Amino acid sequence: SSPGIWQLDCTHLEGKVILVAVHVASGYIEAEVIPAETGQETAYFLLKLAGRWPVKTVHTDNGSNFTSTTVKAACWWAGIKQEDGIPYNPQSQGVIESMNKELKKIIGQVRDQAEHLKTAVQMAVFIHNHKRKGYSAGERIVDIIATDIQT
Amino acid sequence: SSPGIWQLDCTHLEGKVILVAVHVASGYIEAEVIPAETGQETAYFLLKLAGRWPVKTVHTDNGSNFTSTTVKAACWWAGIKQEDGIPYNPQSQGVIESMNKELKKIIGQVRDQAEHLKTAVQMAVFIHNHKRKGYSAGERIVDIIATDIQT
Numbered sequence: 658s659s660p661g662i663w664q665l666d667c668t669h670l671e672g673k674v675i676l677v678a679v680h681v682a683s684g685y686i687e688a689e690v691i692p693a694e695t696g697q698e699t700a701y702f703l704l705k706l707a708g709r710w711p712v713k714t715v716h717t718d719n720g721s722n723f724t725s726t727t728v729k730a731a732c733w734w735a736g737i738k739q740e741d742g743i744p745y746n747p748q749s750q751g752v753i754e755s756m757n758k759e760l761k762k763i764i765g766q767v768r769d770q771a772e773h774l775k776t777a778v779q780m781a782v783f784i785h786n787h788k789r790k791g792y793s794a795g796e797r798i799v800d801i802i803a804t805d806i807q808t
Numbered sequence: 809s810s811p812g813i814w815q816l817d818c819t820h821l822e823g824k825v826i827l828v829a830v831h832v833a834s835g836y837i838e839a840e841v842i843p844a845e846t847g848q849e850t851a852y853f854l855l856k857l858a859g860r861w862p863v864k865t866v867h868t869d870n871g872s873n874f875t876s877t878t879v880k881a882a883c884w885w886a887g888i889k890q891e892d893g894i895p896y897n898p899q900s901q902g903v904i905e906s907m908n909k910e911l912k913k914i915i916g917q918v919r920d921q922a923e924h925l926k927t928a929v930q931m932a933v934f935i936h937n938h939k940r941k942g943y944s945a946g947e948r949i950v951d952i953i954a955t956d957i958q959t
């Protein structure tokens with residue numbers, strides 16, 4: 658199950674919304690800037706994600722996206738099991754919180770290199786996914802999925 | 809090195825532009841709809857791509873993008889070797905052409921399920937990357953990159 662599990666996360670900066678998908682087992686992320694977190698924006702984001710990686714399960718970021726007919730339609734279309742994001746394990750909240758703080762720190766470090774926030778966010782995605790902690794998140798996700806394919 | 813080689817491709821539909829990146833060894837793709845193919849749009853697309861996969865070399869789709877200072881700046885930022893896309897092997901032009909025709913066929917098959925072209929394009933990316941040819945393009949890219957990380 659673990660190779661296909663992702664978590665949605667919504668954070669705010671500069672009066673805008675940054676929508677993040679985290680591959681839970683690796684820490685690998687994809688992210689986008691949107692005007693506001695609507696069902697239509699979340700649905701489209703999930704469609705993109707699932708065309709790019711083998712997304713089996715998504716823990717949604719809030720109850721509005723869990724309820725959304727548009728989000729449910731995208732999950733149906735893309736073969737995604739839509740689940741809640743209730744942190745039954747309480748360390749999940751702290752991990753997400755730490756991630757948002759770290760992403761915002763990186764955005765700050767690149768902000769002056771980017772005219773638009775969306776460029777800074779994608780620079781932050783790049784830096785995060787390439788950072789060695791020794792393997793990177795990008796290396797870990799590929800290894801996890803490749804091992805799963807060989808089953 | 810083949811695991812890191814991508815090719816840019818620009819095709820047109822409904823008076824709009826579809827920008828495609830193909831992982832040459834696997835056939836895996838990412839794509840976006842843009843109003844027009846500018847250096848700024850191409851640069852941003854490459855930044856996104858390189859944050860998500862280990863992009864070493866990009867064969868650019870035309871001379872304007874090869875020349876573009878904005879595209880060159882993004883390639884510099886993201887650690888991408890920007891190359892030309894001259895088909896020294898002539899089978900390349902046919903492979904790209906066949907890809908565009910197939911993508912447009914899939915878009916036609918889903919078009920009525922999508923209000924906006926961009927949704928149809930992402931549905932086509934999904935269908936293409938999951939199609940078993942027996943492995944899918946999505947499976948092939950992960951295997952190729954995972955083997956490269958391990959060797």
Ligand SMILES: O=c1n(-c2ccc(Br)cc2)cc2n1CCCC2
Binds near residue numbers: 794
């Ligand atoms: O590195 C991260 N993150 C993460 C993602 C982005 C940033 Br920026 C910081 C941490 C989230 C997780 N992991 C590892 C596995 C648990 C989930």
Ligand SMILES: [Cl-]
Binds near residue numbers: 674
């Ligand atoms: Cl919002």
Ligand SMILES: [Cl-]
Binds near residue numbers: 697698701
């Ligand atoms: Cl949208």
Ligand SMILES: [Cl-]
Binds near residue numbers: 843844845
């Ligand atoms: Cl154009």
